Amino acid sequence: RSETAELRAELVERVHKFGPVFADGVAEGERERRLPDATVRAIDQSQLAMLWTAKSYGGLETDVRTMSEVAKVLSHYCPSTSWVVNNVNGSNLLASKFPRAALDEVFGDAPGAKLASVFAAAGTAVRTPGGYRLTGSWPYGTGILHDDWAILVAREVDADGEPVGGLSMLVPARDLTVEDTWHTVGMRATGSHTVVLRDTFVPEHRVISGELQRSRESATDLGLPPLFRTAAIAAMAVVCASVVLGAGQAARALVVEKAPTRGIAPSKYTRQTDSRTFVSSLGRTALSIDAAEMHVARAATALDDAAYDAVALPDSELLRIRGDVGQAVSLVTTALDELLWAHGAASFAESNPLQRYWRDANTAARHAMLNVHVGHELYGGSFFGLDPIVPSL
Amino acid sequence: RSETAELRAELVERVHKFGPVFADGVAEGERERRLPDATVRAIDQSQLAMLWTAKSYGGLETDVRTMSEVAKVLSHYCPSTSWVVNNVNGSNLLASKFPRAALDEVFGDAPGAKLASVFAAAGTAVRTPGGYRLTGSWPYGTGILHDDWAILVAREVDADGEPVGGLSMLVPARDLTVEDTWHTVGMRATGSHTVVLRDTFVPEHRVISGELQRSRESATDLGLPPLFRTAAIAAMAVVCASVVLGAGQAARALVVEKAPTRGIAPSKYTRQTDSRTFVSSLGRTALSIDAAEMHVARAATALDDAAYDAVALPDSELLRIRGDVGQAVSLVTTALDELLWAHGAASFAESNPLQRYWRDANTAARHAMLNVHVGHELYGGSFFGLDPIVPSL
Amino acid sequence: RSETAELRAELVERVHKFGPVFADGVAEGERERRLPDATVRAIDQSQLAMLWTAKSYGGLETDVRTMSEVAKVLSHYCPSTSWVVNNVNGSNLLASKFPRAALDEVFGDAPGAKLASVFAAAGTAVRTPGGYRLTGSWPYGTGILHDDWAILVAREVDADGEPVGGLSMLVPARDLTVEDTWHTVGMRATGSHTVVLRDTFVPEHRVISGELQRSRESATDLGLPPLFRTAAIAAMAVVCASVVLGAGQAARALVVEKAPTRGIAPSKYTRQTDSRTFVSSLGRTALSIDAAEMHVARAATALDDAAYDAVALPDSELLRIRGDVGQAVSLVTTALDELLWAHGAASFAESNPLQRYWRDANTAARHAMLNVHVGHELYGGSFFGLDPIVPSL
Amino acid sequence: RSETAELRAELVERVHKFGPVFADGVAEGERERRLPDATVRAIDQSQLAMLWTAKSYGGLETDVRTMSEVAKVLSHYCPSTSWVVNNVNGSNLLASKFPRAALDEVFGDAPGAKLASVFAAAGTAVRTPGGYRLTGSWPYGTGILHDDWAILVAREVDADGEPVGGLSMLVPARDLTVEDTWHTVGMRATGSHTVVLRDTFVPEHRVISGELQRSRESATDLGLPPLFRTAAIAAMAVVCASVVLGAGQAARALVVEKAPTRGIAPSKYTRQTDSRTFVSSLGRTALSIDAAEMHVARAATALDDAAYDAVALPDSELLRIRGDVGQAVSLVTTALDELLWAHGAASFAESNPLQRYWRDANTAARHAMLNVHVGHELYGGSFFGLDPIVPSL
């Protein structure tokens, strides 16, 4: 309790320590659509990619709340860095569904091993002696250029080519080839490129069923540490939402910081703080961001409490969490629009971080697992026990 | 910790135990604009007016969170009862600013003593030998008909009639006269009538300065129990917001309960749950109510944590709480409008509780301490250290 | 053009002339759940129930825009009166789908004949020699107590009781029996009671198919006057939306009128107009009502233009109109909530017209033809040519 | 009437004719932050910069509604082009406040003369023999690189340097020097650079008082054509709002166009049109854009009607128009956020026009004359006759 809360405070302070390095690489990351080498070095030095790595492999092995709070503070310095770091942690946590052989191969001699993952089934696999032969093209591979391994979801087929089942497959960087497809107006430095494979061999021990990848059987396993009892897919959505939330909070802080030194054109208000319309409006916008913060924290706490108690979360609670994260990022994007209205035309200058937070948050917000409309339907459906409209929870 | 959480669960169960009595008196309360005798008996039997009464006087002496959770559940059975109960508790807590002589006179032989309070300075007082002579007319006296005492704010004047200062004055039912002025379309049974006084004597020991009434000096007093270190005015706003919130939650529960047994006219959807537009919309509306719940809980927790730690809350935190409560009730009134759209034309039948929750929540929401626009300006102003636009925090 | 615009100005002035009578009967209508005799006399004297009656029967024979503007002004004096008047006009227009024999029987010696109509198929009819035998129970019969005839939709069945088709059936007051079922918290004076029939004879000439009742074949008929080329069902939705809109505008006017003579509790603003937060907020709320006004006017103009040109409106335009009216009333209900926040706790006093407009608008807004969620789905579906989710347009 | 409506249809068709050229130059304009030469040639060939130029100088001399409708269609092809074209027309109209000598010098031998204008008083002027000496630095000079003249507002000072009054000053390209300061993430091709002047001579005939620049005395002048009776400053705000609106409409069209060929990740909906949540949500978003369209059209019509009738618009109507335009662009930015949610993660690819419309509309929306918060306060204040918070209407 006090131990896990103490660690959080230390990791938050690490983000502030290494923050200036991440901030310094923003301009280059914006140009190159890739995290600078100094940023990657800082991520490795800070151990911020190791929050959800097992303690037995030299990982920090924290909880959802801790990763969430770290994600929010990271976004102040660089949203792309925050997005990459949290996907790595999420991917590393999702890797714990694989056999020990796979985990030993990944983390055995690499405590700071970083994984990518794209869960869209964009490839086909066939059984071969000793494993599988995999072919596919997986887009939105966040941070793939810096990652050691990749978790790729694929559709198994027989000799005829008829679909038989779903698979989740762990494959190293040496077997990967990356196409340059990430040409966007937000989260540019994340380098979410397309992973390509053509008749790539993947052994049995690094392949699991799609069913086992989305399994929550470990929720009640007292043998495992609390972290690995956590609902992993929901946990990933929560920390991704935290990245977006953090950018929104940084945007709010900037607008507050600059408000006393500028006016509201073309009004008589030479100081934005002299306008009570501006001030009351900012109070409203802030409360929406505060609500988004409480949505993320509630979801994180629910996942942690269930993990520590070693109880399985029912579908209703998991569906609510999907509603929470979509709602939180939705509130942030609306709040960011209001903050642009507050700050003015100078928001859209390249020298101004406000448009940086605005663009990055909006791009990341439309990640599948953060879809607000899907979240509303999932959560609304939980009140009547309707069939979930998504495959995994 | 576990003790205070245990008590809450017991008091929540009392609300369910006595709930049917409150529910049974709804029709009469709606007619008579007054709480039925059976309801008042239940309030006295349940000890629900004694949550913020001192343990030394035989009170329960709970915290803000406990009163809040009790308020929310009470609103399911009768919002007017919930509104009256929470004002009594709030008034009883505000009475702790008076001298021991006053508190002994009120609570000494009456553990279940119930106080009214209206903080609008609607009267004038002059010094007389042994105390003051008070004259005034105080509207919105919630539950005055059932109360033993009343806390009335007044403006002190000299022999000439020139204003000299503010006063808070404790005066018994025997000295009170009540005008029938509560003719409303919501919270009818609350009986928020006008208190009238004409040259009424009030002794020194039952009069304090307006400054002392809004004081937070007791926040650091280790001699006092935690409850009386709590910021009382903010605590009252939080529990009033809980009453409104509870009605909104009861409205949501009803709409969920009835949804599978009705359609959406004039559409092809014979069942409301068959419409995914309805379901996703309900998920959205529910999340707004969930946000309002987290706003109230956050404010309650902040007040409790400060009280237990015996630390004074800074103005910024108090201004944020005023933003929280106004935002929460604002979200509830908007959510109620959405729930009427969900349920349909049958919402407005007198036999339907939905319009009951709708009307009661909306009426109570416009209590001064819950003003959403004031809350936005107070909280927004806290970011720049602007002068608060209200007299007390 | 100038002639039809001239008439509108005269009818708007009639509403102001007879308005005081409608306003005088508000208290009684609220008590009795029925329009006072003086109100019914004024409706008959003013010819306001005859706007959509044919000129050949001594009717005014106006257009949709004129009825809409009259409806909005009527709501200022009495929303229930406005709601009843517009339903009568709408019902009278819908009666033009019946044979000349029926129209002559209704309007032949009664220029000011008033019809009710409920389009929910709540009865069953069987063929009998010379017509049909009808049995059913039709709720929400707006203004039935004052009406001469009623248009009732029913499901035809054979001797076995198997459904064969839909019917629309015109039946006089002499054959009607009314159950007292209208016990509501808004639009009380409308007297929307349940119409009951038990083995009632209805002749051939006063019965048409449900298909013919929702027909728009007359849209291109140059023989008919423009009014009867109008899409009647859509026209009714537009004028019903105008009633709700008018109440919202009256609410806005009241808040503006009272703002300079009251403060914002518990703030330092003794005058509501001194608060720029209040003023800017009121400007926003007003613009939403202005948008709702333009939605209704656009729909009315589209229907009129098509009627005068004698061109048929395509489904896409009809689906858009259903989106317009639902959106307009949705904006008004949200705006009314904002106006209560603006005005304060005094809004909910029975002496205050603001809660009167608030309750009446909200109740009327949930009429099937004004369902905002249905309107959104209908209009959204028109972009892709999806099957409409409602039976008639 | 029919003549002016006929011309509009022809100019709308010109936009479609030259549209492909504007669309072809988008990529280069995005790179260079400047309109390509082919785009400038098309603007000159199409006469789209001459809509508000006088007929006596070979201009088209249209009205506000016509320029507005042209602006909306132009934004479909290139928002930057639309923004530049409408500012030129607006600037050319504002030039009609200058003496005939200035107008003859500008338009005498140049029917297609294009003016810039920045109305922020960013310079100081002193009287010199024959005119003034002007020094200043004017940012946000939209399309300055392609313009022949510039209208610059400045503060007149005496020999001591004490402020004496405001001036509006017409100065040619030959006397201008442009600093490269336009480095933005939206409306990049507009080239809104900083105009710099250092001791530049400006003769008497090309200088007017700030009072005369914002004058509406010509509103009743029957000698002038209707266009030059129009309230010029309000007219400019309306057409700027039309540019933003047009981008929003183009965004809506794209989302509708692409909806049937993509799904909603990670849901079971492989087609976006199969989700009724998506469809109803799109209907709602569309209606907000429709409301924004009616806001702009209402303002344009009010300005035109007053110009043709040669009546002066009162302050209340001008304040309402400022509310209309701010509200319209506010609805569009909110609608664009909803359209990104509808379309998904692919919205933010550089190849996708949706982010192009999103970025351009949001940047242009924060033009001073389009400030939503100022508009709300101006319009709200008009209900009580409060002093306007802006210098000119």
Numbering used by the authors:
A (entry chain A), B (entry chain A), C (entry chain A), D (entry chain A): 5 to 397
From the paper:
In vitro characterization, bioinformatics and structural investigations revealed that XiaF is a new member of the group D FMOs, monooxygenases that receive reduced FAD/FMN from a NAD(P)H-dependent flavin reductase and assemble in a tetrameric ACAD-fold composed of N- and C-terminal helical domains and a central β-sheet domain35. At the heart of the biosynthetic pathway, however, we discovered an unusual cyclization cascade involving the non-canonical terpenoid cyclases XiaE and XiaF22. Here we report the in vitro reconstitution of XiaF and a designated flavoenzyme-reductase, which jointly mediate a cryptic indole hydroxylation step that has been proposed to be a key step in non-canonical terpenoid cyclization. Accordingly, in the terpenoid pathway C-3 hydroxylation of the indole ring of indosespene by C4a-hydroperoxyflavin as the electrophilic oxygenating species yields a reactive intermediate (most likely the 3-hydroxyiminium cation 9, although deprotonation to yield an hydroxyindolenine intermediate is also conceivable) that is prone to nucleophilic attack of the exo-methylene group, resulting in the pentacyclic intermediate 16.
To further characterize the non-canonical terpenoid cyclase and the cryptic hydroxylation reaction, we carried out protein crystallization and modelling experiments. The intermolecular interactions between the individual subunits are solely formed between the C-terminal domains, whereas the N-terminal as well as the central β-sheet domains are directed towards the corners of the tetrahedron. The N-domain spans from Met1-Lys118, the β-sheet from Leu119-Ser213 and the C domain from Gly214-Leu397, which describes the typical architecture of a member of the ACAD superfamily. Cocrystallizations of XiaF with flavin proved to be challenging; initially no FAD bound to crystals could be observed when the oxidized cofactor was used. A similar result has been reported for FMN and the XiaF homologue C2-HpaH (4-hydroxyphenylacetate 3-hydroxylase), which has been shown to bind reduced FMN considerably better than oxidized FMN48.
